[PDB]
Design an enzyme around this catalytic site. Structure first.
Site, PDB file in Angstrom:
ATOM      1  N   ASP A  38      35.921  48.106  38.666  1.00  0.00           N
ATOM      2  CA  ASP A  38      37.000  47.185  38.269  1.00  0.00           C
ATOM      3  C   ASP A  38      38.400  47.753  38.534  1.00  0.00           C
ATOM      4  OD1 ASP A  38      38.421  45.019  37.156  1.00  0.00           O
ATOM      5  OD2 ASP A  38      38.184  45.744  35.117  1.00  0.00           O
ATOM      6  N   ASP A 224      42.212  42.724  42.400  1.00  0.00           N
ATOM      7  CA  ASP A 224      41.312  42.906  41.261  1.00  0.00           C
ATOM      8  C   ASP A 224      39.836  42.702  41.607  1.00  0.00           C
ATOM      9  OD1 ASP A 224      40.061  43.000  38.766  1.00  0.00           O
ATOM     10  OD2 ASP A 224      41.370  41.523  37.834  1.00  0.00           O
TER      11      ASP A 224
HETATM   12  C1  LIG Z   1      35.128  37.867  34.539  1.00  0.00           C
HETATM   13  O1  LIG Z   1      36.337  38.129  35.242  1.00  0.00           O
HETATM   14  C2  LIG Z   1      37.438  38.030  34.336  1.00  0.00           C
HETATM   15  C3  LIG Z   1      38.640  37.418  35.049  1.00  0.00           C
HETATM   16  C4  LIG Z   1      37.799  39.418  33.809  1.00  0.00           C
HETATM   17  O2  LIG Z   1      38.333  39.477  32.701  1.00  0.00           O
HETATM   18  N1  LIG Z   1      37.526  40.495  34.552  1.00  0.00           N
HETATM   19  C5  LIG Z   1      37.845  41.866  34.106  1.00  0.00           C
HETATM   20  C6  LIG Z   1      36.647  42.817  34.327  1.00  0.00           C
HETATM   21  C7  LIG Z   1      35.297  42.219  33.905  1.00  0.00           C
HETATM   22  C8  LIG Z   1      34.825  42.329  32.597  1.00  0.00           C
HETATM   23  C9  LIG Z   1      33.589  41.767  32.255  1.00  0.00           C
HETATM   24  C10 LIG Z   1      32.823  41.102  33.221  1.00  0.00           C
HETATM   25  C11 LIG Z   1      33.298  41.005  34.536  1.00  0.00           C
HETATM   26  C12 LIG Z   1      32.597  40.317  35.528  1.00  0.00           C
HETATM   27  N2  LIG Z   1      31.820  39.238  35.383  1.00  0.00           N
HETATM   28  C13 LIG Z   1      31.299  38.750  36.526  1.00  0.00           C
HETATM   29  C14 LIG Z   1      31.646  39.393  37.652  1.00  0.00           C
HETATM   30  S1  LIG Z   1      32.675  40.658  37.198  1.00  0.00           S
HETATM   31  C15 LIG Z   1      34.528  41.558  34.859  1.00  0.00           C
HETATM   32  C16 LIG Z   1      39.117  42.398  34.812  1.00  0.00           C
HETATM   33  O3  LIG Z   1      39.457  43.655  34.239  1.00  0.00           O
HETATM   34  C17 LIG Z   1      40.337  41.449  34.718  1.00  0.00           C
HETATM   35  N3  LIG Z   1      41.547  42.116  35.267  1.00  0.00           N
HETATM   36  C18 LIG Z   1      42.835  41.548  34.773  1.00  0.00           C
HETATM   37  C19 LIG Z   1      43.026  40.112  35.311  1.00  0.00           C
HETATM   38  C20 LIG Z   1      44.152  39.427  34.516  1.00  0.00           C
HETATM   39  C21 LIG Z   1      44.564  38.087  35.123  1.00  0.00           C
HETATM   40  C22 LIG Z   1      45.904  38.707  35.562  1.00  0.00           C
HETATM   41  C23 LIG Z   1      45.542  40.007  34.834  1.00  0.00           C
HETATM   42  O4  LIG Z   1      43.851  39.310  33.110  1.00  0.00           O
HETATM   43  C24 LIG Z   1      43.421  40.453  32.503  1.00  0.00           C
HETATM   44  N4  LIG Z   1      43.482  40.478  31.159  1.00  0.00           N
HETATM   45  C25 LIG Z   1      43.093  41.537  30.466  1.00  0.00           C
HETATM   46  C26 LIG Z   1      42.603  42.674  31.106  1.00  0.00           C
HETATM   47  C27 LIG Z   1      42.185  43.892  30.261  1.00  0.00           C
HETATM   48  C28 LIG Z   1      43.397  44.819  29.943  1.00  0.00           C
HETATM   49  C29 LIG Z   1      43.819  45.617  31.175  1.00  0.00           C
HETATM   50  C30 LIG Z   1      44.601  44.021  29.416  1.00  0.00           C
HETATM   51  C31 LIG Z   1      43.002  45.817  28.852  1.00  0.00           C
HETATM   52  C32 LIG Z   1      42.522  42.692  32.502  1.00  0.00           C
HETATM   53  C33 LIG Z   1      42.924  41.562  33.221  1.00  0.00           C
END
Ligand SMILES: CO[C@H](C)C(=O)N[C@@H](Cc1cccc(-c2nccs2)c1)[C@H](O)CN[C@H]1CC2(CCC2)Oc2ncc(CC(C)(C)C)cc21
Length: 375
Positions: A38, A224
């Protein structure tokens, strides 16, 4: 084991839409776990207690090298969240560099909509910067620990490949030239928190959206690997969808298809790829008034799901532009932390089209690029 780049080629796996993972070990003796890659977060966290969706988890009691930090932690992603207990332990990447480091680990004890039934991963490796780490930026992320403790160069590259099983490569500490063709084109990292970049121009089938370039980066643009879709700000999303709709208007679609809530299906092998436009994202370059473009094929933004069935993989955002996994697929992406830049090249595992090709092209001239950044 030498830590040579060839040893890291094809070290990523995944199930479609469930994220790319790399094999890691934690503790002594080494406990093997699969870990989501990630670039959109900065915490290294692993399941450390039973969960309906976990087939295995980190057992701190069985590790002789485990050290409790006596501090709790939680991380809220967009929908999912976990909470746990902070510690440090020894960490290796079997199909990675020939090193072991002591890294911060959040031991997940409770979670909500984080783990996925059948994903085959048990944790997350946040590869972004300390500024966005929880509970705060004093919690050193894994890659910072890796670079500090070893001679592994301060960079990594990702080659995310398509198909259902998915695969790819994380080259840790360098660039493997067998994984891409043509030239690498670089965009500056604007700020070290997320991997933030600046989009300077957007074209759809060679036609400029002609929006104020600030709209493309409102309120940020990031790369991302932990987000599936291309995510676009409301105004940009609406313009893009209007353009894609009009390009493909000879076909009939449900209203919720464009929202990502419905599937569209075609007779196996008759998908009308030609009616869906290419999208060109122009990124700020390395020299004055210079940019380059990456071109996205519809095969990237129409994500195959189980006749050939597809979800629309562009979604509306109120949190900025996200160049997710569907954008990264078919490119070789270099996260050159050392030189504060992200490189793009056509991947060796490029997505096929009959008459079009995903491309990375430059140089382009673009005036007033600094005006494109949101403040
Ligand atoms: C599901 O995808 C959604 C958008 C997601 O939240 N993905 C996660 C990582 C993650 C966590 C759990 C599961 C997954 C996946 N599911 C399926 C494929 S990958 C992926 C990824 O870290 C998102 N990155 C940004 C993406 C954004 C959108 C712009 C920034 O929103 C975010 N909000 C909070 C965080 C956590 C912090 C850094 C604040 C502590 C990060 C983010």
């Amino acid at each position: 084991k030498k830590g040579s780049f060839v040893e890291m080629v094809d070290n990523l796996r995944g199930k479609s839409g469930q994220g790319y993972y790399v094999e890691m070990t934690v503790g002594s003796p080494p406990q093997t776990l699969n870990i989501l890659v990630d670039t959109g977060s900065s915490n290294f966290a692993v399941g450390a207690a039973p969960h309906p969706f976990l087939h295995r988890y980190y057992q701190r009691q069985l590790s002789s090298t485990y050290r409790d930090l006596r501090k709790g932690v939680y991380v809220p992603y967009t929908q999912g969240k976990w909470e746990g207990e902070l510690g440090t332990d020894l960490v290796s990447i079997p199909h990675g560099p020939n090193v072991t480091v002591r890294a911060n680990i959040a031991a997940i004890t409770e979670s909500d909509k984080f783990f996925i039934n059948g994903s085959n991963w048990e944790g997350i490796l946040g590869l972004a910067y300390a500024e966005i780490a929880r509970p705060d930026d004093s919690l050193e992320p894994f890659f910072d620990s890796l670079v500090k403790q070893t001679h592994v160069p301060n960079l990594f590259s990702l080659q995310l490949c398509g198909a259902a099983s998915v695969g790819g490569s994380m080259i840790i500490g360098g660039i493997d030239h067998s994984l891409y063709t043509g030239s690498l084109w670089y965009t500056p990292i604007r700020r070290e928190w997320y991997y933030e970049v600046i989009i300077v121009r957007v074209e759809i089938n060679g036609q400029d959206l002609k929006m104020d370039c600030k709209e493309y980066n409102y309120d940020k643009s990031i790369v991302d690997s932990g987000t599936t879709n291309l995510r676009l700000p409301k105004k940009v999303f609406e313009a893009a969808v209007k353009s894609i709709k009009a390009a493909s208007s000879t076909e009939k679609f449900p209203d919720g298809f464009w929202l990502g809530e419905q599937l569209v299906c075609w007779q196996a092998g008759t998908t009308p790829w030609n009616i869906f436009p290419v999208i060109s994202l122009y990124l700020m370059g390395e020299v004055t008034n210079q940019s380059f473009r990456i071109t996205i094929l519809p095969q990237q933004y129409l994500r195959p799901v189980e006749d050939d069935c597809y979800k629309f993989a562009i979604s509306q955002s109120s949190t900025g532009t996200v160049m997710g996994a569907v954008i990264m697929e078919g490119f070789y992406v270099v996260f050159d932390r050392a030189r504060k830049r992200i490189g793009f090249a056509v991947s060796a595992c490029h997505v096929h089209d009959e008459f079009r090709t995903a491309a990375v092209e430059g140089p382009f001239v673009t005036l007033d690029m600094e005006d494109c950044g949101y403040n």
